Write a protein that holds these residues in place. Structure first.
Motif, mmCIF file in Angstrom:
data_model
loop_
_atom_site.group_PDB
_atom_site.id
_atom_site.type_symbol
_atom_site.label_atom_id
_atom_site.label_comp_id
_atom_site.label_asym_id
_atom_site.label_seq_id
_atom_site.Cartn_x
_atom_site.Cartn_y
_atom_site.Cartn_z
ATOM 1 N N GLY A 60 2.309 7.748 -16.843
ATOM 2 C CA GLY A 60 1.153 7.535 -17.719
ATOM 3 C C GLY A 60 -0.179 7.370 -16.990
ATOM 4 O O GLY A 60 -0.317 7.770 -15.817
ATOM 5 N N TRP A 61 -1.143 6.763 -17.689
ATOM 6 C CA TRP A 61 -2.535 6.788 -17.284
ATOM 7 C C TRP A 61 -3.089 5.428 -16.952
ATOM 8 O O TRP A 61 -4.276 5.303 -16.668
ATOM 9 C CB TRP A 61 -3.405 7.436 -18.371
ATOM 10 C CG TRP A 61 -3.018 8.855 -18.751
ATOM 11 C CD1 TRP A 61 -2.620 9.295 -19.999
ATOM 12 C CD2 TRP A 61 -2.990 10.004 -17.896
ATOM 13 N NE1 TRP A 61 -2.367 10.657 -19.966
ATOM 14 C CE2 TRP A 61 -2.582 11.112 -18.691
ATOM 15 C CE3 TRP A 61 -3.301 10.217 -16.548
ATOM 16 C CZ2 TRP A 61 -2.466 12.412 -18.170
ATOM 17 C CZ3 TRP A 61 -3.185 11.508 -16.029
ATOM 18 C CH2 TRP A 61 -2.770 12.587 -16.838
ATOM 19 N N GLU A 62 -2.245 4.404 -16.981
ATOM 20 C CA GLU A 62 -2.707 3.022 -16.757
ATOM 21 C C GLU A 62 -1.778 2.225 -15.850
ATOM 22 O O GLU A 62 -0.561 2.371 -15.927
ATOM 23 C CB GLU A 62 -2.873 2.292 -18.093
ATOM 24 C CG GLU A 62 -3.842 2.967 -19.054
ATOM 25 C CD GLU A 62 -3.780 2.415 -20.455
ATOM 26 O OE1 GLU A 62 -3.345 1.250 -20.605
ATOM 27 O OE2 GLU A 62 -4.168 3.151 -21.403
ATOM 28 N N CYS A 63 -2.359 1.400 -14.985
ATOM 29 C CA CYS A 63 -1.609 0.369 -14.271
ATOM 30 C C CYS A 63 -1.127 -0.709 -15.246
ATOM 31 O O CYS A 63 -1.742 -0.941 -16.298
ATOM 32 C CB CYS A 63 -2.456 -0.289 -13.181
ATOM 33 S SG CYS A 63 -2.825 0.760 -11.763
ATOM 34 N N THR A 64 -0.010 -1.339 -14.871
ATOM 35 C CA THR A 64 0.568 -2.522 -15.538
ATOM 36 C C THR A 64 0.849 -3.565 -14.456
ATOM 37 O O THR A 64 0.880 -3.224 -13.261
ATOM 38 C CB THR A 64 1.892 -2.192 -16.271
ATOM 39 O OG1 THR A 64 2.781 -1.527 -15.363
ATOM 40 C CG2 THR A 64 1.663 -1.299 -17.485
ATOM 41 N N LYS A 65 1.047 -4.820 -14.877
ATOM 42 C CA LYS A 65 1.394 -5.953 -13.992
ATOM 43 C C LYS A 65 2.454 -5.614 -12.943
ATOM 44 O O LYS A 65 2.242 -5.823 -11.745
ATOM 45 C CB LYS A 65 1.868 -7.137 -14.827
ATOM 46 C CG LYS A 65 0.782 -7.757 -15.687
ATOM 47 C CD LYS A 65 1.279 -7.984 -17.108
ATOM 48 C CE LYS A 65 0.426 -9.026 -17.821
ATOM 49 N NZ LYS A 65 0.332 -8.782 -19.288
ATOM 50 N N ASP A 66 3.576 -5.057 -13.396
ATOM 51 C CA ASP A 66 4.682 -4.675 -12.490
ATOM 52 C C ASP A 66 4.349 -3.593 -11.445
ATOM 53 O O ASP A 66 4.961 -3.575 -10.377
ATOM 54 C CB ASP A 66 5.962 -4.312 -13.267
ATOM 55 C CG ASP A 66 5.684 -3.492 -14.513
ATOM 56 O OD1 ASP A 66 5.349 -4.103 -15.560
ATOM 57 O OD2 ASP A 66 5.809 -2.243 -14.444
ATOM 58 N N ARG A 67 3.388 -2.714 -11.746
ATOM 59 C CA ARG A 67 3.002 -1.619 -10.837
ATOM 60 C C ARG A 67 2.104 -2.038 -9.658
ATOM 61 O O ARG A 67 1.934 -1.276 -8.709
ATOM 62 C CB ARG A 67 2.338 -0.487 -11.620
ATOM 63 C CG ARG A 67 3.287 0.361 -12.445
ATOM 64 C CD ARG A 67 2.656 1.702 -12.809
ATOM 65 N NE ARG A 67 2.468 2.569 -11.636
ATOM 66 C CZ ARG A 67 1.835 3.744 -11.642
ATOM 67 N NH1 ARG A 67 1.312 4.240 -12.763
ATOM 68 N NH2 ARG A 67 1.735 4.436 -10.519
ATOM 69 N N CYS A 68 1.549 -3.250 -9.720
ATOM 70 C CA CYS A 68 0.559 -3.717 -8.739
ATOM 71 C C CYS A 68 1.110 -3.808 -7.329
ATOM 72 O O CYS A 68 2.189 -4.350 -7.115
ATOM 73 C CB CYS A 68 -0.049 -5.045 -9.176
ATOM 74 S SG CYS A 68 -0.964 -4.867 -10.723
ATOM 75 N N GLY A 69 0.370 -3.244 -6.382
ATOM 76 C CA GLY A 69 0.786 -3.168 -4.985
ATOM 77 C C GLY A 69 2.123 -2.486 -4.735
ATOM 78 O O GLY A 69 2.766 -2.762 -3.734
ATOM 79 N N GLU A 70 2.536 -1.604 -5.646
ATOM 80 C CA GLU A 70 3.727 -0.771 -5.480
ATOM 81 C C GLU A 70 3.646 0.076 -4.199
ATOM 82 O O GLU A 70 2.585 0.191 -3.568
ATOM 83 C CB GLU A 70 3.923 0.144 -6.709
ATOM 84 C CG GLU A 70 2.995 1.373 -6.743
ATOM 85 C CD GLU A 70 2.714 1.954 -8.130
ATOM 86 O OE1 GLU A 70 3.268 1.487 -9.154
ATOM 87 O OE2 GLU A 70 1.899 2.897 -8.195
ATOM 88 N N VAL A 71 4.786 0.648 -3.818
ATOM 89 C CA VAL A 71 4.839 1.661 -2.772
ATOM 90 C C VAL A 71 4.366 2.970 -3.405
ATOM 91 O O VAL A 71 4.831 3.346 -4.489
ATOM 92 C CB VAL A 71 6.268 1.830 -2.179
ATOM 93 C CG1 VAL A 71 6.279 2.856 -1.049
ATOM 94 C CG2 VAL A 71 6.817 0.493 -1.685
ATOM 95 N N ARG A 72 3.429 3.633 -2.724
ATOM 96 C CA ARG A 72 2.910 4.929 -3.134
ATOM 97 C C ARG A 72 4.019 5.969 -3.393
ATOM 98 O O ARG A 72 4.831 6.269 -2.523
ATOM 99 C CB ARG A 72 1.897 5.455 -2.111
ATOM 100 C CG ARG A 72 1.481 6.896 -2.365
ATOM 101 C CD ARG A 72 0.323 7.312 -1.495
ATOM 102 N NE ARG A 72 -0.942 6.798 -2.019
ATOM 103 C CZ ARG A 72 -1.734 7.435 -2.881
ATOM 104 N NH1 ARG A 72 -1.418 8.640 -3.353
ATOM 105 N NH2 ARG A 72 -2.858 6.850 -3.270
ATOM 106 N N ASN A 73 4.024 6.494 -4.613
ATOM 107 C CA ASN A 73 4.906 7.553 -5.038
ATOM 108 C C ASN A 73 4.038 8.734 -5.472
ATOM 109 O O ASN A 73 3.385 8.665 -6.530
ATOM 110 C CB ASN A 73 5.775 7.037 -6.197
ATOM 111 C CG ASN A 73 6.817 8.043 -6.664
ATOM 112 O OD1 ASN A 73 6.751 9.233 -6.347
ATOM 113 N ND2 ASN A 73 7.788 7.563 -7.446
#
Ligand SMILES: *[C@@H]1O[C@H](CO)[C@@H](O[C@@H]2O[C@H](CO)[C@@H](O[C@@H]3O[C@H](CO[C@H]4O[C@H](CO)[C@@H](O)[C@H](O[C@H]5O[C@H](CO)[C@@H](O)[C@H](O)[C@@H]5O[C@H]5O[C@H](CO)[C@@H](O)[C@H](O)[C@@H]5O)[C@@H]4O)[C@@H](O)[C@H](O[C@H]4O[C@H](CO)[C@@H](O)[C@H](O)[C@@H]4O[C@H]4O[C@H](CO)[C@@H](O)[C@H](O)[C@@H]4O)[C@@H]3O)[C@H](O)[C@H]2NC(C)=O)[C@H](O)[C@H]1NC(C)=O
Ligand SMILES: Nc1ncc(-c2ccc(C(F)(F)F)cc2)nc1Br
Ligand SMILES: [Br-]
Ligand SMILES: [Ca+2]
Ligand SMILES: [Cl-]
Ligand SMILES: [K+]
Ligand code: NA
Ligand SMILES: [Zn+2]
Length: 802
Positions: free
Chosen positions: A49-62
């Motif tokens: 999708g088009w938006e960050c969420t709480k869980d996505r923060c500082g994720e490993v780049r995919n």
């Protein structure tokens, strides 16, 4: 043929487009069916999708993700637009109090503030107010930046004519895109919305902004987006280009939305299904400004929010059919819809006559919903004649209606509820302008202006010199904090003679006749020396901007610039105060024409030519009706105040001079009037030279005007009289066609009070239109700044309600 088997790796939305058969990865490749095999996979990612969420923060780049919520994303310039809001506790741009942007606040290495043009198809001007609750981002732009209550599109109010005017500063007649659909006789080719031929470069004249940028060393993002590239992807692409190294980063960008035009056509301009597209558009603006805020560019970039045209309620039942008027309906081609263009189905048909077609389409039904015209008889304000792609026969269609050839055409295509393309003065066709950034003003409302003016302003915002165009450069200086363009008044090319009394009465043999004390003799001589000139010439004499031979003639009530070449005034200037009285022409003077002893017989008109010419009569530029005394009334009958008029046009002119001039003097607290003839036989909107004149009064060298103009000026603060005005001015003007019949006006056999003023309103004009047509330059000597005078000269009084 494309070798679609090259790749797009590292090439996604390439700024330089590559040449066939090597495959393309640019934002237009889809439209040409020419993308590389892997374009969808690498360039049109959607994953997550088009938006960050709480869980996505500082994720490993995919790399598969549409946009990123990882740590490095800011450097890379590819975060989702809400990344800092969701992962770093930042606020949305719409939620921040607005603060004046006094100077560009840009990252190091930017040489100039970038410009982003955010264009919206079919964004009608009244949506700013009517949709204001559902568009909070746009409302912040509007109220914090510089805005107009509306912007005037060009005719026809179609998409490609208008988009290409925005790009170039040119009338459709000059840029060449005179319609959404077109036939060009020289190429023997057609141009259509569906298809390949619109991609060919020979259709597109002038020099659009992206080419103007490139030629002058300002890099441009590609302006055009394939319809299937989603809006979020267009935004992320622009944010990405903005993250490039200084040597590769474009300075000017465009976004385009298909909405709200697309839904407007299906649902009408205010259909309840219209709320959602407006919501989606505002959301897109939000994403852009949040994205700019993340890159610290939100106080650096100039943003233009601009539409192409509005949208009107139109349905199938409101269709006029040519088959109800013409028995020959199969020998014509019609370009149909919100305007009509008619040509012959086959050029081998020698029986085809435009005159008989026009006559059969004229005032036939009591509430007829279109009016036929030869294109050269269209109101001059439309500038819609000087192109081989515009058919000789035109139909101006009433707002809310369609014209079609045969009923079959409509029901073998009810579908639509919105359409556009009508006269550009119609309220529902009006569109939007908002400017926001360091170069625009803060919290400023500007008056309505025409879209032809924008190219110059986008050039100013980028430090470019504009290609020659139809804007008046400087007329929009009041939108700008700085980067204004300070033009100089053009220089006068011809200076006038000031002739005294040099000829005796008996030297005149003109076939003219007229039935016609020291205190009052010194008096009348100073009147002739120019003693009341400061009353009748309020803003200086107009400057003649071409080579010709002319005289200034002074009188008690009026002053004129008399042309020895055309044998009549180029211009006649006079002031009518609030208190002035109308008198009639006395009986002893009905057919009076007097020799002017300052002007040689050889430079004079003569009565014998009018007597001979069975079709042609004469009128006066200064109206005798408004003479200030019985003695001054004689000046109005001078042969040098006379001009050729068809008896049908005299009815128009006499009503304007006898009734309307006084009416406006009462309503406006006095008026200044400058009137004159116009010669435009080749309908190019430009002054004719003498060798261009197609018609003369029979047996004489007296040329016949195609039009008559008047410019009516007073004080914007109407509590001050026109001759004693301390501040800004107020103008309205007209260019009336000089026609041998009144067929244009369906009610013309009624009293002039029922049809004349309506005709004049139709033929309303800018002072600037009159300048092109006469080669004169007005308002030379005022106390006002020149930029303000340029704005006044581009004003159009439209006579539409609020
Ligand atoms: C709105 O703004 C615009 C832009 O400023 C104004 O239009 C200009 O008006 C000028 C006067 O009409 C005009 O100048 C002429 O240019 C001729 C060279 O033209 C080419 O080069 C320019 C610049 O690169 C280019 O833009 C032109 O592009 C036009 O043509 C192609 C199609 O052929 C289109 O792709 C393009 O859209 C554009 O079309 C439009 O303009 C033409 C007129 O040029 C129209 O006919 C079209 O319908 C359409 O509206 C050109 O590729 C040059 O040849 C002319 O010179 C002749 O006349 C002068 C008189 O001074 C004389 O000195 C010369 O001898 C010469 O005469 C000879 O040719 C005659 C005709 O063939 C012949 O009869 C004689 O006997 C001679 O042999 C002239 O200088 C300028 O091109 C346009 N520019 C544009 C972009 O339109 C416009 O006036 C403004 N409108 C208003 C109301 O203010
Ligand atoms: N698909 C499309 N993509 C882009 C545009 C476009 C046209 C003009 C301009 C302007 F205003 F700068 F001139 C910007 C963008 N039109 C279409 Br149709
Ligand atoms: Br375009
Ligand atoms: Ca002309
Ligand atoms: Cl069209
Ligand atoms: K006559
Ligand atoms: Na009539
Ligand atoms: Zn449309």
């Amino acid at each position: 043929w494309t070798a679609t088997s090259g790749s797009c790796k590292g090439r996604c939305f390439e700024l330089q487009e590559v040449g066939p058969p090597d495959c393309r990865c640019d934002n237009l490749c889809k439209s040409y069916s020419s993308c590389c095999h892997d374009f969808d996979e690498l360039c049109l990612k959607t994953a997550r999708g088009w938006e960050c969420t709480k869980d996505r923060c500082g994720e490993v780049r995919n790399e598969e993700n549409a946009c990123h919520c990882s740590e490095d994303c800011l450097s890379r310039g590819d975060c989702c637009t809400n990344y800092q809001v969701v992962c770093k506790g930042e606020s949305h741009w719409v939620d921040d109090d607005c603060e004046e942007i006094k100077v560009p606040e840009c990252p190091a290495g930017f040489v100039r503030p970038p410009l982003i043009i955010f264009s919206v198809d079919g964004f009608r001007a009244s949506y700013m107010k009517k949709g204001s609750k559902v568009m909070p981002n746009i409302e912040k732009l509007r109220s914090c930046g510089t805005h107009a209550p509306y912007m005037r599109p060009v005719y026809p109010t179609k998409t490609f004519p208008n988009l290409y005017t925005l790009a170039t500063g040119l009338y459709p007649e000059s840029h060449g895109i005179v319609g959404n659909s077109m036939y060009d006789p020289v190429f023997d080719a057609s141009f259509h919305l569906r298809g390949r031929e619109k991609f060919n470069h020979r259709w597109w004249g002038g020099q659009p902004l992206w080419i103007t940028a490139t030629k002058q060393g300002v890099r441009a993002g590609t302006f055009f987006w394939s319809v299937s590239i989603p809006h979020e992807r267009r935004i992320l692409t622009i944010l990405q280009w903005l993250s490039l190294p200084d040597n590769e980063r474009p300075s000017v960008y465009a976004f385009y939305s298909e909405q709200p035009d697309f839904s407007g056509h299906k649902y009408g301009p205010f259909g309840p299904e219209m709320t959602n597209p407006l919501r989606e558009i505002d959301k897109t603006v939000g994403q852009l400004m949040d994205g700019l805020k993340q890159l610290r560019l939100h106080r650096c970039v100039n943003v233009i929010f601009v539409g192409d045209h509005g949208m009107e309620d139109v349905t199938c039942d409101r269709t006029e059919f040519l088959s109800n008027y013409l028995t020959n309906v199969d020998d014509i081609t019609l370009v149909p819809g919100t305007l009509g263009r008619i040509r012959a189905k086959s050029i081998n048909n020698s029986k085809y006559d435009p005159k008989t077609i026009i006559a059969a389409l004229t005032c036939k039904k009591p509430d007829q919903h279109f009016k036929p015209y030869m294109k050269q008889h269209l109101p001059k304000r439309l500038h819609y004649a000087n192109n081989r792609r515009i058919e000789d026969i035109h139909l101006l269609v009433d707002r809310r209606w369609h014209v079609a050839r045969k009923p079959l055409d409509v029901y073998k295509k009810c579908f639509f509820q919105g359409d556009h393309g009508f006269d550009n003065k119609v309220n529902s066709m009006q569109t939007v302008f908002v400017g926001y950034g360091p170069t625009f003003k803060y919290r400023t409302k500007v008056p309505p202006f025409e879209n032809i003016e924008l190219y110059n302003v986008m050039c100013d915002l980028l430090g470019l010199k504009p290609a020659p165009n139809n804007g008046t450069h400087g007329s929009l200086n009041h939108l700008l904090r700085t980067n204004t363009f300070r033009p100089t008044m053009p220089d006068e090319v011809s200076r006038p003679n000031y002739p005294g009394i040099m000829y005796l009465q008996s030297e005149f043999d003109l076939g003219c006749t007229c039935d016609d004390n020291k205190l009052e003799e010194l008096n009348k001589r100073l009147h002739t020396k120019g003693s009341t000139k400061e009353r009748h010439l309020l803003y200086g004499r107009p400057a003649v901007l071409y080579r010709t031979s002319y005289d200034i003639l002074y009188h008690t009530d009026f002053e004129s610039g008399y042309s020895e070449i055309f044998l009549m005034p180029l211009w006649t200037s006079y002031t009518i105060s609030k208190q002035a009285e109308v008198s009639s022409i006395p009986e002893h003077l009905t057919n009076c024409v007097r020799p002017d002893v300052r002007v040689s017989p050889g430079f004079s008109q003569n009565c014998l030519a009018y007597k001979n010419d069975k079709q042609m009569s004469y009128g006066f530029l200064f109206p005798p009706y408004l003479s200030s005394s019985p003695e001054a009334k004689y000046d109005a009958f001078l042969v040098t105040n006379m001009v050729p008029m068809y008896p049908a046009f005299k009815r128009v002119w006499a009503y304007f001079q006898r009734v309307l001039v006084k009416k406006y003097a009462s309503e406006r607290n006095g008026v200044n009037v400058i009137s004159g003839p116009i010669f435009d036989y080749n309908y190019d909107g430009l002054r004719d030279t003498e060798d261009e004149i197609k018609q003369y009064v029979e047996g004489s060298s007296i040329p016949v005007p195609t039009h008559y103009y008047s410019i009516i000026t007073s004080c914007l603060d109407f509590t001050q009289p026109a001759d004693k005005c301390d501040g800004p001015l107020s103008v309205s003007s007209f260019i009336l066609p000089h026609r041998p019949d009144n067929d244009e006006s369906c009610n013309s056999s009624e009293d002039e009070s029922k049809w004349v003023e309506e005709l004049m309103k139709m033929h309303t004009a800018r002072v600037r239109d009159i300048e092109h047509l006469t080669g004169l330059d007005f308002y030379r000597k005022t106390s006002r700044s020149y930029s303000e005078i340029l704005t006044l000269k581009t004003y159009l009084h439209t006579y539409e309600s609020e």
